[PDB]
Amino acid sequence: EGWFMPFDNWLYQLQNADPVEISSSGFEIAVIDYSKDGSESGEYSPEEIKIMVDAGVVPVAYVNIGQAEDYRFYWKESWYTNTPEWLGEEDPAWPGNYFVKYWYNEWKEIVFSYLDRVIDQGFKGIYLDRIDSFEYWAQEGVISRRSAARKMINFVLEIAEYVRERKPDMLIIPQNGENILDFDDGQLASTVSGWAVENLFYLKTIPLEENETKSRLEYLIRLNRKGKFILSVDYVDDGSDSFENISRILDYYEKAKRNGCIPYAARSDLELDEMNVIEGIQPP
């Protein structure tokens, strides 16, 4: 069910991204972190980002809007002792990431200050992680599911207003949480430029139940039909030249393209640490 696909490929790399390497790789759109090491001192310069723009690559900045990350410029040492009401527990699965009450003004103003830097660096899109934080707080019983969903929708809308006031063409791509559209009045679906998803056909190496995949696709197809691109990333490539492995990459690409999803086969380590070239396939 796969028609609106304005990019031939995409790159997801959050560590060790190299503008020169990317600029001459043949990837069309690259989602990287806004810093070489995530930290303030590693922030890409306007010039380093312009290398990619100059080669016709569309560079997009990852921004985690559902969790505080303890190595970022915004993190404060005082938060360990005098903990803000909106800073919650550490993510068992991602040490150094903390769930936040993303509806509190102070968290929003941190995220706006991060967007401020991303705009000035010359990024052409933002890729917004932990939309699914709405599910986390609902599971914790801290607020209602509807409350959380609304709050996250409104926040992404406020993020769209902030960045488009400065850069009207800025792309806006949330990651995961696409089921949040159940609570959208349609303004979020129209405001995004596209939507990115992890673990659609495969959870790492392991193929998913077809029903689970179809529920997710129900949301993505609707967006596609409205002129919104869908970036897929499955962590299917185990690094080997095995037969199993390459057949799996090819199965993933075929399932992706047949349903309108632009695929990126990433390493099953989850590190997103290199530009993952796969001879004859990625880029294609």
Author numbering: 28 to 311
Text from the published report:
Endo-galactosaminidases are an underexplored family of enzymes involved in the degradation of galactosaminogalactan (GAG) and other galactosamine-containing cationic exopolysaccharides produced by fungi and bacteria. Whereas the fungal enzyme belongs to family GH114, the two bacterial enzymes do not lie in the current GH families but instead define a new family, GH191. The TIM-barrel core structure with fully conserved active-site residues and a negatively charged substrate crevice is conserved among all the families. The putative active-site residues (Asp156/Glu225 for TmGH191, Asp323/Glu391 for Env-GH191 and Asp157/Glu225 for FsGH114) overlap well with the experimentally verified nucleophile and general acid/base Asp189/Glu247 in Ega3, Asp196/Glu222 in Sph3 and Asp160/Glu223 in PelAH.
